[PDB]
């Protein structure tokens, strides 16, 4: 699980651009305030390599 990808972001990246910011994403109308919960998910998820 050492390899992670950005599942959620507000906008698409530019060419040759890396995003490593571990900020929470707001998927709904309600603000998340940096805390996980309903419709608040972490952007980086790990691959299940077996």
């Amino acid at each position: 699980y050492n390899y992670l990808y950005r599942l959620f972001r507000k906008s698409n990246l530019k060419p040759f651009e890396r995003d490593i910011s571990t900020e929470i994403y707001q998927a709904g109308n309600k603000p998340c305030n940096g805390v996980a919960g309903f419709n608040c998910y972490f952007p980086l998820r790990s691959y299940s390599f077996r």
Partner: peptide, 8 residues
Amino acid sequence: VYAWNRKR
């Protein structure tokens, strides 16, 4: 992939 390494 989110933190891909770039080497010159």
